[PDB]
Ligand binder design. Structure first.
Ligand SMILES: CC1(C)S[C@@H]2[C@H](NC(=O)[C@H](N)c3ccccc3)C(=O)N2[C@H]1C(=O)O
Lengths: 108, 108
């Protein structure tokens, strides 16, 4: 199964599917120990998943590039998704996301 | 519907759902005039969607950020998806992506 279509679970976790969290430019940086171990089996996965784009919105919203390099041909992307700072749930949404962003720094 | 969960189609097209294509960091750059007007109705949409990330992959592969600002809050994302050059339609995939990346610059 191609990487971008994979689904992390406890049986095939975030490290297994998507590699060690870390600081380098195309290394993923999201997930505390719990989410890394659990993937989509994490009990608050739906709270995170609400921010993930549809395929339509991924190619609609993103800045897309294509790079040909010694490692192969890559589809590059950047973008931003705006939260609803008016939502009463907003504060708890930020905390949850901040909890996973760069969490790897605090453990081996 | 939240922007990231929208699905463009001929009845609700890329521009209506995700704004004009353009050079700005908040705009998208992807799609020629056929893709913009048809969205997921686009004849080659399946061949573009194959490179769009699953919710697990979006959070597993991407460099994720949170910009909490007095004027609004955004989940940031960047990354790279390698193409499969062993795929029989690799060359067609490269030609397809080339037709849409930044196509807006030519529009009459
Ligand atoms: C003449 C071609 C452009 S169509 C044919 C096929 N490539 C395809 O696009 C394929 N059948 C197809 C997939 C999806 C939608 C529509 C068509 C192939 O190979 N050919 C090209 C060529 O080499 O010149």
């Amino acid at each position: 199964k191609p990487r971008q279509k994979r689904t992390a679970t406890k049986a095939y976790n975030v490290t297994q599917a998507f590699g060690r969290r870390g600081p380098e430019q195309t290394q993923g940086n999201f997930g505390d120990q719990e989410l890394i171990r659990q993937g989509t089996d994490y009990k608050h996965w739906p709270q995170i998943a609400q921010f993930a784009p549809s395929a339509s919105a991924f190619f609609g919203m993103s800045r897309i590039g294509m790079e040909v390099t010694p490692s192969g041909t890559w589809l590059t992307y950047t973008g931003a998704i705006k939260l609803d700072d008016k939502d009463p749930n907003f504060k708890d949404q930020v905390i949850l996301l901040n909890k996973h962003i760069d969490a790897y720094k605090t453990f081996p």
